Design a protein around this ligand. Structure first.
Ligand SMILES: [K+]
Ligand SMILES: [K+]
Ligand SMILES: [K+]
Ligand SMILES: [K+]
Ligand SMILES: [K+]
Ligand SMILES: [K+]
Ligand SMILES: [K+]
Ligand SMILES: [K+]
Ligand SMILES: [K+]
Ligand SMILES: [K+]
Ligand SMILES: [K+]
Ligand SMILES: [K+]
Ligand SMILES: [K+]
Ligand SMILES: [K+]
Ligand SMILES: [K+]
Ligand SMILES: [K+]
Ligand SMILES: [K+]
Ligand SMILES: [K+]
Ligand SMILES: [K+]
Ligand SMILES: [K+]
Ligand SMILES: [Mg+2]
Ligand SMILES: [Mg+2]
Ligand SMILES: [Mg+2]
Ligand SMILES: [Mg+2]
Ligand SMILES: [Mg+2]
Ligand SMILES: [Mg+2]
Ligand SMILES: [Mg+2]
Ligand SMILES: [Mg+2]
Ligand SMILES: [Mg+2]
Ligand SMILES: [Mg+2]
Ligand SMILES: [Mg+2]
Ligand SMILES: [Mg+2]
Ligand SMILES: [Mg+2]
Ligand SMILES: [Mg+2]
Ligand SMILES: [Mg+2]
Ligand SMILES: [Mg+2]
Ligand SMILES: [Mg+2]
Ligand SMILES: [Mg+2]
Ligand SMILES: [Mg+2]
Ligand SMILES: [Mg+2]
Ligand SMILES: [Mg+2]
Ligand SMILES: [Mg+2]
Ligand SMILES: [Mg+2]
Ligand SMILES: [Mg+2]
Ligand SMILES: [Mg+2]
Ligand SMILES: [Mg+2]
Ligand SMILES: [Mg+2]
Ligand SMILES: [Mg+2]
Ligand SMILES: [Mg+2]
Ligand SMILES: [Mg+2]
Ligand SMILES: [Mg+2]
Ligand SMILES: [Mg+2]
Ligand SMILES: [Mg+2]
Ligand SMILES: [Zn+2]
Lengths: 149, 129, 98, 141, 84
RNA sequence: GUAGGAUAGUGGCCUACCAUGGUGGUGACGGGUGACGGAGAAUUAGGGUUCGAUUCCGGAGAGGGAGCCUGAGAAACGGCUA
RNA sequence: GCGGUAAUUCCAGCUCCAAUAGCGUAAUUUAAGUUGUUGCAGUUAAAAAGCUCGUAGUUGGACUUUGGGAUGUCCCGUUACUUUGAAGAAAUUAGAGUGCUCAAAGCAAGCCUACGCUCUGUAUACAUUAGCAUGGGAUAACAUUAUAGGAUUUCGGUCCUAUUUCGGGAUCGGAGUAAUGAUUAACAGGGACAGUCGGGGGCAUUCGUAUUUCAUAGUCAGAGGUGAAAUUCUUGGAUUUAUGAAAGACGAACAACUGCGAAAGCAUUUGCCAAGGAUGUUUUCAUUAAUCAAGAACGAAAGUUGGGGGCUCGAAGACGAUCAGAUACCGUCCUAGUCUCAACCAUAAACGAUGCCGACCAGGGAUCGGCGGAUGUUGCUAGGACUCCGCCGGCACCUUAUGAGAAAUCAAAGUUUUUGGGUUCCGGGGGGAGUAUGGUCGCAAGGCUGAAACUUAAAGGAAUUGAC
RNA sequence: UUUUUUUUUUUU
């Protein structure tokens, strides 16, 4: 179930059994990589790039044509962000909640949600430190969290 | 969370057999589960079982003969030497004439009588009768 | 021993329900538990309907109606006989009397 | 449910150790309070008779059970000891030396006698049983 | 249907379609791609059936679909053909 | 840790200088034990529970401490010194 | 439990019963599945912290070499664990032999009387953990992987050493060889995205009748309250009527076996601020997870400190009734309080008297949110409302036993002597007692942690009959 | 919906 709630939703994607690109698709792997790199330079995260490719360019799965993931391509071309996308978004949410709490001191619900969000942030940061996606000196501090983004 | 896929599979088969179903579904699949099913099929406590590929852990559909009184997992997987097999059989099996205890040894997954024959110890996985 | 599955009230998936005041004694009782009845009756009783109609000051006029929502606590409802003690099997019946 | 981890032996042992104290017998035998009781962990104790007393029997019985107030020599504690058998209180006198044993229920009252956990076995070095059966005679001095 | 009246390995196609996408014998999505063409422009664009973005035709700068809770809603003028 | 003294000999065993180290919820440290430890004893489906001063093995003591001569061997006590 | 003047139960006689040279009486084992690892309980018998987070601890999805031909044999980094071996005082224990007259014992002893013999015997087994050595590589634990600073062949420059140009090194580059090197994406989890949904939260801001008070106007004799009265208000006009103003609470009807929230709790409108579940997804990461000592956030009502408010109701208090009394139940007037702000308090039958995560497990009709499909209407503007068929998630309900239970009952309180998915807390007959003491928190009230002496044969749960 | 308190010990 949900990590920080009692929800038991199972909504998710159902990848097709076929791992090969559709016949009607004609774009080439280098062209797909070039488009991905162009989007990254424009400032789109891997999830946004995948959404755009699926919705506009007819690329259901980038791995099907290129053989590698979007983040892998970005890292190979030296375009991956310093901090991972999910951790960045979690830190953004924590910063927004703290900004709201700075003016709403009676929002104990906001305080509770901030506690949950920072717990998630710390767990994710610990995992990324273990996997060496973050420097060992990295540490999430509430006071200067806004600087990181 | 899912801790013992073998336990889930064995419980599903046991409940299905009690209910009288002719076929049972096991998800996710595993090689330990397949070895356990092969051990049971060797002695005839189950029929044919078919593995379904889905580019994931997989699935299994097992036909049930109606001969399976009860199959279960032993957790944690206690270490069983060749001299402790008698005690484990006395504890777990209804009788000394029939019933099997499945062990994982360095020689592979096998029943307790085969383990005694080969003089090999290991860890208890489960039982069936 | 527990004698009612619902515990004598109608609270499900809910923490707290605000109370009402008994229309008879004023006792505080949770709204989901209070015995609620709706009475819609002619302002003029059937006995005086004919006299009031004869005394009507207009060529035609429809007598109004009085609407009252009575909310009783359990004790007042039982005492006034709005509800009665039922058998173990009969108290599971939820349909209103015919 | 129970902890079943293969590496949870420490937790299981420590939980059992903590829960053993809920057992009254284990606590009685392991708290070291037997040494503060009148007998101090002994089967028998010698004492001096202080006074004869009559204790009313508990309901629904009605009787006067005969007991003696005895001061134990080894620690000076005062206890009440029942005197069994008919007319056996006559063999007990003030300042007599009496051997005192338990009442059989391990420090608890027996029968309809309230708050009495001891009985007299010997008086002046002679068994009350022998005195009752006239086998022996109480020493004159 | 009674378990013993069906084969878990050969389920009927109607039942497989009716089942949840993740609960089928082999997971398969209910989405699809479509070739959409405007009312006036010969250009043809590939659109996801559940598009989350407002796809716009490059030539005439016209919106083809509007994101919704589920399937994207195409503009009245434009039309689509299932691509697959 | 370095260098020495002492010891039958290794070692903060002790001395001088240097460094801040060492242990700890995987329970240090502190407290209780009517606690010498073991070989073993009682009861025995299995797992277990309780006991172990006492004749065998190892340790310690000779009213409580401390010091020491003799001697291969003692900090000895049916040896000495306070 | 016997004994209250007909005592199988006391004191005695007779007789009888158990054991027997023994038997009775006053720490410890079994019985005890009443300490439960094997193997106990936690809805009502004793019991799950009010709720959530969370470090130690415990636990943790799938995936990497199978097969035939033949015949043990041939072909395509560190550990846990398990097999075997060595060694591991006696005594004791198990056990082989042996007529101490038998036996507990002992290690004796046996033939024949040979100036003797049986080389007479005085075996064997067991022995947790830990250590040593050895075979196996299933199941598991830790470490590693991709910025190539990777493996390997050859060769160019640099730095040092030995046995009789050479061997051994230790670095810096050129060239080549290669299938050149990344499992999948869990009906695990996190994050992004899209339309939604909600009485979730905070701030600000409209509305509502009613209550009380006040102002104006009209009328006159009662009004109020009770079972009946009285206290009480009333010609200085009570109660009642109309209009208007002010104040503070409260958000009826709609309103439900309906919704949201971790719980507590949350119901007038509109605006702002962040937050959230579910749904949809051929989007992204790739195990990042489950549960949790210590440690933290919130936490009804009452209560505390100080302001602001103070309509209503109303602990305390004062009166009137009732009563044998009535410090009450009823009535009348009221202080604190009831509302809000700042700071505390942290407890409730904080209840589903029922921990969380995961799997399986009968049927049926409703209902809330989202989504997919079909179809026909709408005093409407492709949409919305309704109709029908489905999927996911949620609050619940009805039937049923093939289940469980002491039953009451439970579709989870099932899948339990056919006992084992992971994990936290917690109970051990009833009282003394949630007391004493110590510690800690609090302004206080008290909260958290928490005994013993002693006492006792029952207390208690479900259900049946009767009586009331 | 005025008011209605009490019943020595054991045993049958
Ligand atoms: K959760
Ligand atoms: K979703
Ligand atoms: K209840
Ligand atoms: K009700
Ligand atoms: K009495
Ligand atoms: K009696
Ligand atoms: K030395
Ligand atoms: K040194
Ligand atoms: K010692
Ligand atoms: K000498
Ligand atoms: K008589
Ligand atoms: K008589
Ligand atoms: K008797
Ligand atoms: K007030
Ligand atoms: K009275
Ligand atoms: K008052
Ligand atoms: K409080
Ligand atoms: K309740
Ligand atoms: K539903
Ligand atoms: K009596
Ligand atoms: Mg969690
Ligand atoms: Mg799920
Ligand atoms: Mg009742
Ligand atoms: Mg509540
Ligand atoms: Mg030295
Ligand atoms: Mg001692
Ligand atoms: Mg000893
Ligand atoms: Mg002695
Ligand atoms: Mg000795
Ligand atoms: Mg000595
Ligand atoms: Mg002496
Ligand atoms: Mg001396
Ligand atoms: Mg000496
Ligand atoms: Mg001597
Ligand atoms: Mg008689
Ligand atoms: Mg007699
Ligand atoms: Mg019990
Ligand atoms: Mg109770
Ligand atoms: Mg209880
Ligand atoms: Mg509770
Ligand atoms: Mg805690
Ligand atoms: Mg595994
Ligand atoms: Mg997935
Ligand atoms: Mg008015
Ligand atoms: Mg309203
Ligand atoms: Mg609603
Ligand atoms: Mg104030
Ligand atoms: Mg008032
Ligand atoms: Mg208050
Ligand atoms: Mg409490
Ligand atoms: Mg719906
Ligand atoms: Mg108790
Ligand atoms: Mg009286
Ligand atoms: Zn009422």
């Amino acid at each position: 179930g949900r990590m920080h709630s009692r929800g038991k939703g199972i909504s998710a994607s159902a990848l097709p059994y076929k791992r090969t690109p559709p016949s009607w698709l004609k774009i080439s792997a280098p062209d797909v990589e070039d488009n991905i790199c162009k989007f990254a330079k424009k400032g789109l995260t891997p999830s946004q790039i995948g959404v755009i490719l699926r919705d506009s360019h007819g690329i259901a799965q980038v791995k099907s044509v290129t053989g590698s993931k979007i983040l892998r391509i970005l890292k190979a071309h030296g375009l991956a962000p310093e901090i991972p996308e999910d951790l960045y978004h979690l830190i953004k949410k924590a910063v927004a909640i703290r900004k709201h709490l700075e003016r709403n001191r009676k929002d104990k619900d906001s305080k509770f949600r901030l506690i949950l969000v920072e717990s998630r942030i710390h767990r994710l940061a610990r995992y990324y430190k273990k996997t060496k996606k973050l420097p060992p000196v990295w540490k999430y501090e509430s006071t200067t969290a806004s600087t990181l983004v | 969370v899912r801790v013992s896929v073998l336990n889930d599979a064995l419980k599903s088969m046991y409940n299905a057999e009690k209910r009288g179903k002719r076929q049972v579904m096991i998800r996710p699949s595993s090689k330990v589960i397949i070895k356990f099913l092969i051990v049971m099929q060797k002695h005839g406590y189950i029929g044919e079982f078919e593995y379904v590929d889905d580019h994931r852990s997989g699935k299994i559909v097992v036909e049930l003969n109606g001969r399976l009184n009860k199959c279960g997992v032993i957790s944690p997987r206690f270490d069983v030497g060749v001299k402790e097999i008698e005690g484990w059989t006395a504890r777990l099996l209804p009788s000394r004439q029939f019933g099997y205890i499945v062990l994982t040894t360095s020689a592979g997954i096998m029943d307790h009588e085969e383990a005694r024959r080969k003089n090999v110890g290991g860890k208890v996985l489960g039982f069936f009768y | 021993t527990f004698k009612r599955r619902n515990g004598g009230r109608n609270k499900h998936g809910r923490g707290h329900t605000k109370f009402i005041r008994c229309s008879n004694c004023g006792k505080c009782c949770p709204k989901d538990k209070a015995i609620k009845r709706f009475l819609v009756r002619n302002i003029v009783e059937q006995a005086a309907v004919r006299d009031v109609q004869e005394a009507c000051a207009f060529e035609t006029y429809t007598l109004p109606k009085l609407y009252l929502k009575m909310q009783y606590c359990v004790s007042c409802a039982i005492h006034s006989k709005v509800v009665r003690v039922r058998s173990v099997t009969d108290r599971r019946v939820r349909e209103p009397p015919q | 449910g129970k902890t079943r981890g293969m590496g949870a032996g420490r937790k299981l042992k420590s939980h059992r150790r903590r829960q053993r104290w809920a057992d009254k017998s284990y606590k009685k035998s392991h708290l070291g309070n037997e040494w503060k009781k009148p007998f101090a962990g002994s089967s028998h104790a010698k004492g001096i008779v202080l006074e004869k007393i009559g204790i009313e029997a508990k309901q629904p019985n009605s009787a006067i059970r005969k007991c003696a107030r005895v001061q134990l020599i080894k620690n000076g504690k005062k206890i009440a000891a029942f005197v069994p058998n008919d007319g056996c209180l006559n063999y007990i006198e003030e300042n007599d030396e009496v051997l005192i044993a338990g009442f059989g229920r391990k420090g608890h009252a027996v029968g309809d006698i309230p708050g009495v956990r001891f009985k007299v076995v010997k008086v002046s070095g002679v068994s009350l049983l022998a005195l009752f059966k006239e086998k022996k005679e109480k020493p004159r001095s | 249907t009674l378990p013993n009246d069906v084969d878990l390995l050969n389920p009927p196609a109607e039942l497989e379609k009716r089942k949840h996408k993740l609960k089928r014998l082999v997971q398969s999505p209910n989405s699809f791609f479509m070739d959409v063409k405007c009312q006036g422009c010969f250009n043809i664009t590939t659109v996801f059936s559940h598009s989350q973005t407002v796809v716009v035709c490059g030539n005439c700068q016209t919106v083809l679909c509007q994101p919704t809770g589920g399937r994207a809603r195409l503009t009245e003028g434009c039309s689509f053909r299932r691509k697959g």
